[PDB]
Amino acid sequence: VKRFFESYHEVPDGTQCHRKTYITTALGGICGIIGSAYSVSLNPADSTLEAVARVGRYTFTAAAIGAMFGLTTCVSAQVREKPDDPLNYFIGGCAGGLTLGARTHSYGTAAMGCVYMGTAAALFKIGKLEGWELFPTPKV
Amino acid sequence: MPSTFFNLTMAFSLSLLGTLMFRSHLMSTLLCLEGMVLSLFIMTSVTSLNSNSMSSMPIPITILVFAACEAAVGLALLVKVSNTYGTDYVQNLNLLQC
Amino acid sequence: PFLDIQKKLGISLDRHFMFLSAEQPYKNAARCHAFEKEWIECAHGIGGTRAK
Amino acid sequence: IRWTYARSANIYPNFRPTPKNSLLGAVAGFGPLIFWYYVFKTDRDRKERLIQEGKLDRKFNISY
Amino acid sequence: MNPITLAIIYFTIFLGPVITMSSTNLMLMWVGLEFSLLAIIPMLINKKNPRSTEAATKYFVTQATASMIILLAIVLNYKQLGTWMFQQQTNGLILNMTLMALSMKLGLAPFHFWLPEVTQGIPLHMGLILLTWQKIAPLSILIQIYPLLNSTIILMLAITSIFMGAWGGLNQTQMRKIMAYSSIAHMGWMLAILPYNPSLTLLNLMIYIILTAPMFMALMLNNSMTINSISLLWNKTPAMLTMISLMLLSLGGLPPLTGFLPKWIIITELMKNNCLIMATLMAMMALLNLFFYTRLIYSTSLTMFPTNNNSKMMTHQTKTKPNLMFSTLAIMSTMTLPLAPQLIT
Amino acid sequence: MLKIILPSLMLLPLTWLSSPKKTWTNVTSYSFLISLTSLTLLWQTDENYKNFSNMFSSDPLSTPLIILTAWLLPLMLMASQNHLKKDNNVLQKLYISMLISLQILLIMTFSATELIMFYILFEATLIPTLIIITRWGNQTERLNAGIYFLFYTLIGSIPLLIALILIQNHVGTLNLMILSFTTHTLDASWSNNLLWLACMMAFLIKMPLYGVHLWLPKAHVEAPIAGSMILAAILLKLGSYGMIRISIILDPLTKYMAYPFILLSLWGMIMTSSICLRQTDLKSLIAYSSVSHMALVIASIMIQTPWSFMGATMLMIAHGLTSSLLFCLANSNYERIHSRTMIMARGLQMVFPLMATWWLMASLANLALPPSINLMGELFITMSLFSWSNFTIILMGINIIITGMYSMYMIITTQRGKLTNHMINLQPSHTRELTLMALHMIPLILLTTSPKLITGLTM
Amino acid sequence: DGPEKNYEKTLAILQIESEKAELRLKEQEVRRLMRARGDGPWYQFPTPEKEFIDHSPKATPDN
Amino acid sequence: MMNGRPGHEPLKFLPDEARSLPPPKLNDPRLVYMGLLGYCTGLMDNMLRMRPVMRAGLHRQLLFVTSFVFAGYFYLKRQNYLYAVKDHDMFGYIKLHPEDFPEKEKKTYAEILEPFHPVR
Amino acid sequence: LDLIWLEKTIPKSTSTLHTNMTTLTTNQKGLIKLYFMSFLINIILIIILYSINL
Numbered sequence A: 001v002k003r004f005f006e007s008y009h010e011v012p013d014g015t016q017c018h019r020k021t022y023i024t025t026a027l028g029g030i031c032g033i034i035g036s037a038y039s040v041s042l043n044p045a046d047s048t049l050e051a052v053a054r055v056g057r058y059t060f061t062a063a064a065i066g067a068m069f070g071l072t073t074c075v076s077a078q079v080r081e082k083p084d085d086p087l088n089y090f091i092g093g094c095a096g097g098l099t100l101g102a103r104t105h106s107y108g109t110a111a112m113g114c115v116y117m118g119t120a121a122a123l124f125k126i127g128k129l130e131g132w133e134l135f136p137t138p139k140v
Numbered sequence B: 001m002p003s004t005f006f007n008l009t010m011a012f013s014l015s016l017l018g019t020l021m022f023r024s025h026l027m028s029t030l031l032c033l034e035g036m037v038l039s040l041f042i043m044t045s046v047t048s049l050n051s052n053s054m055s056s057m058p059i060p061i062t063i064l065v066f067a068a069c070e071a072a073v074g075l076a077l078l079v080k081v082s083n084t085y086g087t088d089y090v091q092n093l094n095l096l097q098c
Numbered sequence C: 001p002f003l004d005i006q007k008k009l010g011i012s013l014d015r016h017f018m019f020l021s022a023e024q025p026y027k028n029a030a031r032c033h034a035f036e037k038e039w040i041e042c043a044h045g046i047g048g049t050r051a052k
Numbered sequence D: 001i002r003w004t005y006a007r008s009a010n011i012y013p014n015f016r017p018t019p020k021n022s023l024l025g026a027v028a029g030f031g032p033l034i035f036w037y038y039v040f041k042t043d044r045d046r047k048e049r050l051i052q053e054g055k056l057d058r059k060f061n062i063s064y
Numbered sequence E: 001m002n003p004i005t006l007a008i009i010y011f012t013i014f015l016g017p018v019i020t021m022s023s024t025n026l027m028l029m030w031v032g033l034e035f036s037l038l039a040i041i042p043m044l045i046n047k048k049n050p051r052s053t054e055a056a057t058k059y060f061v062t063q064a065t066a067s068m069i070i071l072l073a074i075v076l077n078y079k080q081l082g083t084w085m086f087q088q089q090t091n092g093l094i095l096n097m098t099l100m101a102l103s104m105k106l107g108l109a110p111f112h113f114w115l116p117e118v119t120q121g122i123p124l125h126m127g128l129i130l131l132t133w134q135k136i137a138p139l140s141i142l143i144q145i146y147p148l149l150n151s152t153i154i155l156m157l158a159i160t161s162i163f164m165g166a167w168g169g170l171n172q173t174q175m176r177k178i179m180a181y182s183s184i185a186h187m188g189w190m191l192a193i194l195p196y197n198p199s200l201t202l203l204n205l206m207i208y209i210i211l212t213a214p215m216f217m218a219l220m221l222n223n224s225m226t227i228n229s230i231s232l233l234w235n236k237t238p239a240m241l242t243m244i245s246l247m248l249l250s251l252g253g254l255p256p257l258t259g260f261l262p263k264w265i266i267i268t269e270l271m272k273n274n275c276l277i278m279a280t281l282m283a284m285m286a287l288l289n290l291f292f293y294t295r296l297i298y299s300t301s302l303t304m305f306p307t308n309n310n311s312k313m314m315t316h317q318t319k320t321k322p323n324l325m326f327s328t329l330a331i332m333s334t335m336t337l338p339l340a341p342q343l344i345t
Numbered sequence F: 001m002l003k004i005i006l007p008s009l010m011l012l013p014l015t016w017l018s019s020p021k022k023t024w025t026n027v028t029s030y031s032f033l034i035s036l037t038s039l040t041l042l043w044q045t046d047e048n049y050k051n052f053s054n055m056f057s058s059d060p061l062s063t064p065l066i067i068l069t070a071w072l073l074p075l076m077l078m079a080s081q082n083h084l085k086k087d088n089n090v091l092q093k094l095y096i097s098m099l100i101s102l103q104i105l106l107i108m109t110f111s112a113t114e115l116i117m118f119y120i121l122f123e124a125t126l127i128p129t130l131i132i133i134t135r136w137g138n139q140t141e142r143l144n145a146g147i148y149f150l151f152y153t154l155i156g157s158i159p160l161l162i163a164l165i166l167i168q169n170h171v172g173t174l175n176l177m178i179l180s181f182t183t184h185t186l187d188a189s190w191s192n193n194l195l196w197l198a199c200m201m202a203f204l205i206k207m208p209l210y211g212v213h214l215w216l217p218k219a220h221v222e223a224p225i226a227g228s229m230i231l232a233a234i235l236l237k238l239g240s241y242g243m244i245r246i247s248i249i250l251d252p253l254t255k256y257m258a259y260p261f262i263l264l265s266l267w268g269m270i271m272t273s274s275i276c277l278r279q280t281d282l283k284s285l286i287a288y289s290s291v292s293h294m295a296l297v298i299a300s301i302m303i304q305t306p307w308s309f310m311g312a313t314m315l316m317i318a319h320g321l322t323s324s325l326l327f328c329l330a331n332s333n334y335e336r337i338h339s340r341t342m343i344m345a346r347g348l349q350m351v352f353p354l355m356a357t358w359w360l361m362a363s364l365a366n367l368a369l370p371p372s373i374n375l376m377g378e379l380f381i382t383m384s385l386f387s388w389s390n391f392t393i394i395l396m397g398i399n400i401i402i403t404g405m406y407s408m409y410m411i412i413t414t415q416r417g418k419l420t421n422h423m424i425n426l427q428p429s430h431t432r433e434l435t436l437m438a439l440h441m442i443p444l445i446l447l448t449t450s451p452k453l454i455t456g457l458t459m
Numbered sequence G: 001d002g003p004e005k006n007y008e009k010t011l012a013i014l015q016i017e018s019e020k021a022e023l024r025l026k027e028q029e030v031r032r033l034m035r036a037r038g039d040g041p042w043y044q045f046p047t048p049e050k051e052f053i054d055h056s057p058k059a060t061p062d063n
Numbered sequence H: 001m002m003n004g005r006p007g008h009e010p011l012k013f014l015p016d017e018a019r020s021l022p023p024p025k026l027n028d029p030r031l032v033y034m035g036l037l038g039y040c041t042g043l044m045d046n047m048l049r050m051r052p053v054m055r056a057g058l059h060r061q062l063l064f065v066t067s068f069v070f071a072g073y074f075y076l077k078r079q080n081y082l083y084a085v086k087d088h089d090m091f092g093y094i095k096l097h098p099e100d101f102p103e104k105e106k107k108t109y110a111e112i113l114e115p116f117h118p119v120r
Numbered sequence I: 001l002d003l004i005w006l007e008k009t010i011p012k013s014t015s016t017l018h019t020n021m022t023t024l025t026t027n028q029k030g031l032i033k034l035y036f037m038s039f040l041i042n043i044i045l046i047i048i049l050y051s052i053n054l
């Protein structure tokens, strides 16, 4: 999965949009599996049928988050012809937020997701442009 | 020795996974804890005998004594649970949530 | 260790059986005694990073 | 007292978001801002360009 | 308990972490850990109630699992390197299991689910003993191996520790649970500063201990288990609300209190090591911690909650309960900030 | 600066050791002497800056703020004398101690030569305002107002702390003069943009900027009179001083990062002046007037003209004085009628002629009457804003028109008209509160007479 | 007193602050270099002691 | 980070080379603040035990002030030694590695061209 | 603006978000079985991050 995750970054944005959507969908799926496992273990369902139904619901929701994020980001980058720009990631994160609000069926959650995920995606894009270390090895 | 040590580490891993996945019996949980203890004793003893480390063969004796006193403490706690609730079911132990 | 009471008082409560090439009963050498002695003799006095 | 409470403290408990007031709040909180942004941006870009090729004359302007 | 077993149990509680700190052997640090655990268990089950039994059982099974993982790491290191100390080239898997089990012993998130429940149901002085004394030994083992640990795993554990601690302390009302999630957030701060500067980890640990002690003494003055119970403190002991406010603001990290110094120097060192995003998230969750502290301050000191009728008789009675070193720890935990270069090393 | 800090520090043992029948007198007289001693920082016979020590210094911008704080402290005690007359001696001495702590920490805050010390003293001043508002506030919304104020300000101030530590690591000392001398240009990258926002938003919250100004009206309403004074007259200007100190090391990208905040300030002073027109609470109306005036200060500081910096300085001092006077008149009416309603007390010109006169001069200073320092600040801000862009004059004109409208609406509905004859509990006047209005209004006249003292750093 | 006193006091303050600035930058560089390659007093991670090694002749000759 | 230095005496409070340092002046703001903190501790203890705040326990307040000043003095001596030996190791490492710390030739304001950003 | 939408935008939205998060994160049933299952998930996750970090 390693070469997969840094194979998202081997191509410039606005190019290989289907591939970028597939990798971001896979990342969202893994995050949804982790969150669903935590949900069904901390808060157990009444039976295994609705337990695995909750797992599938969370996984599909987060996979849709990743799919909409990757598709919106790559489409915006290619239609505005400037890949190294955080606003593409802001629009993609906002589209993911509207996707989360549609899955939750709440426009308030849509607005939360849009603003917060767009800000997070913009900061992530800035970090990947200009070298922010999220987990740096000790140096001093 | 590497195959048998791998088998011992997988035995410890299985006992740990059994400890982490609770059932209705705190006795079974304590038995899984001593499955881990026994696996630790065999790995320490085989390592000491393979390395001829006569200075460190007391270490299995110390792990046995210390883990046995720890399990005596745990058995006393399970006795207290069985006395207050009739049984040793771990789902009876849940009123500290609030 | 985190605290050096053993080094301050000069006692050796548990420092004399740290490794295989340490003191042994009736001078029974452990396996790789020479190799571990060579490693410790190399690594002493230069720190962990330079030892690595 | 009832009039002051209704005008001051009852508004947010008794507010519910509807599409009409959402659109009204969006336009009343943003449209003047983008409008004056474009006005001031066009004026400042024109003035800056006029200074860069020197067509704007500041004959006695020293206290800016 | 008679004084013979009281002395034996307290001496072993003292002796466990002392062996762990004084010991240069992984085996001896392990045995000091179960001296601490085994000696403190009768002190939790001292009150003999179902809640105390529940807390003792959960605490025992958590520490037993973590101690067995620690011994697994020690035995694997002993096979791989032939010694009894993670020297320089022990396996990263072994080091990560060691960090896993020490974080489980400490009760920091996502291994934090037992600490508020164990802190609840036991008396306040045992909550103080747990939340202050029982953490020096796992911190000692963590400090002894600082250059070998994994910064990514530590940073994840720390940031989720502060997140869950802030959210829990925001959530509940119970004083012991509030102090437990406060401990989880503070251990998140210490764990985050651990791989870069263990001296600042020790400084944060001492600041947290000298802030936790007068909280627990003030709670033990009236056995105030509840936000309401500490809210009618103005009728019981009005001469303490000022120090309650000052020490809770110090726990929140507000300047010019000396509790701002650990967070400040930790952020400074983390930014010396360039983890700006992590430091920002930690500081925002510290603001959440300060929020539930400020709500507690509002309940107990700045407002005056309604009282009872038997509080008149309780004021009629006298008291000699509050000890002498409450004020010393209180002053050292409030007004020490201009001595910051002396506090840091 | 130590000769001002130490006797203000020794005011606290005087407060806690004075007799209960002499505490107010002793502390008020000695704090007046503190203000008199603090007047010695105006001895600036050279272009050089008064660097008293390695830690404290005085400046042409820092000096008027220090003198203003030292002047407001005895006025604070005078305003707090009345509503604590039925209160315990220990709590009275505690309140006096809280005010003295405000005065001390604000002098150190304005006189600090280090931005990290400035930040420490920044929320070290935040704490006792919280305590004053939360404990001695009257209504039930004081707790919520304290929460709003504290958390707007702290969510502002945390990225300021991160930006300060980053600047210290990048440069080396974070000393103000060392930064001012070895200022380095920025590369206009995203990291520098986010750093600029981090070091700007704390002072923008403390100003408050429009959109994030919601903590101010409720804090000013539910605060006591001393809290309203300290907020409206010192703390907003403290955020002002913070931006002026921090803007030197932010070239060149402030010339385009200034854009959203200038627009927010202009449209927000228009918005808040409209709220002042349609406001039913006197304290809320004065609070929103303060928001509009500090929005003018934002516009000047962000356009960064020297004339704008001067206008911001004179507007700082003038608005602090006139806002404190307005809150004092509102608090006198509130202690008369036990209500905060704008329309409930109407014909006070009849019963209180001298207090209505003080009302009139306070409102005339509020609406920028010439040749006051208020209008000098607004006019020079107007000149600099028109130099920055010629279409700012429309927003300035709308703001000034609505400013005159809300000031005269205040005067008409609080003084003029028929008297509400049902208010038979109208005591004539306290010499204490009349003295309070006089001590607020006379320094406005003196600074109008000599405006060179509050011109600031630029000229 | 006069303007020269404030002028020279400001000069002394600026000298002290500049020296503190360059000292802080140098100690950052020193700590980074020493942590990267520990060869001085600081960041000396421990190492097992040679004094607890048996050097006497033993039962097995091949040691 | 300074525990592994050569010549480190284990668990030694004030080693003999610390005797080379000048002692604190014994009337300096740190120790004066320590005495003030001890006095405040005594007053706070009196108020918490519901005694007269200043008129009671004068021996207790004197003991508090004396112990605070004593402990602060010895801790200040240790901290001064620690900062001095940190600076000593700093300057020794800088002298021992001159190629990593070059004295850069820094120009005046006559060869460097800072860009001008007009405010208008 | 002031009494509806800025309140709905910054402070009440932040408070509602943190209230929802703290309820969701501390709706704990109080079962040591669920807690140890969570601990097992944490162990598996940390092994996964070690394997992908190397």
Ligand SMILES: CCCCCCCCCCCCCCCCCC(=O)OC[C@H](COP(=O)([O-])OCC[N+](C)(C)C)OC(=O)CCCCCCCCCCCCCCCCC
Pocket: A123, A130, A131, A132, E276, E277, E280, E281, E284, F152, F155, F156, F157, F158, F159, F160, F162, F163, F166, F191, F192, F194, F195, F197, F198, F201, F205, I009, I010, I011, I014
């Ligand atoms: C009151 C306002 C609240 C909202 C706005 C908050 C500030 C927004 C702008 C600053 C970013 C966030 C704070 C970072 C502080 C440090 C900035 C800095 O040093 O930048 C340069 C640095 C970059 O450092 P650098 O300059 O060394 O870059 C490296 C450059 N090279 C490689 C060439 C050497 O930027 C960052 O590190 C920013 C990362 C921020 C990530 C975390 C953000 C968390 C969320 C923040 C807001 C939370 C509260 C509000 C939530 C919503 C409420 C409704």
Ligand SMILES: CCCCCCCCCCCCCCCCCC(=O)OC[C@H](COP(=O)(O)OCCN)OC(=O)CCCCCCCCCCCCCCCCC
Pocket: E281, E284, E285, E287, E288, E291, F144, F147, F148, F151, F152, F155, F156, F210, F211, F212, I010, I011, I012, I014, I015, I016, I018, I019
């Ligand atoms: C134009 C510029 C736009 C950009 C700038 C926007 C930001 C401006 C500054 C932010 C201001 C935030 C203000 C927050 C406080 C106001 C809300 C509040 O008061 O909530 C109260 C409520 C508890 O109320 P309670 O007292 O229990 O009951 C009511 C009466 N008894 O509280 C609750 O229910 C929960 C409150 C939680 C604590 C809130 C304060 C801390 C918030 C921390 C945010 C961290 C953000 C980053 C997180 C990590 C990344 C996702």
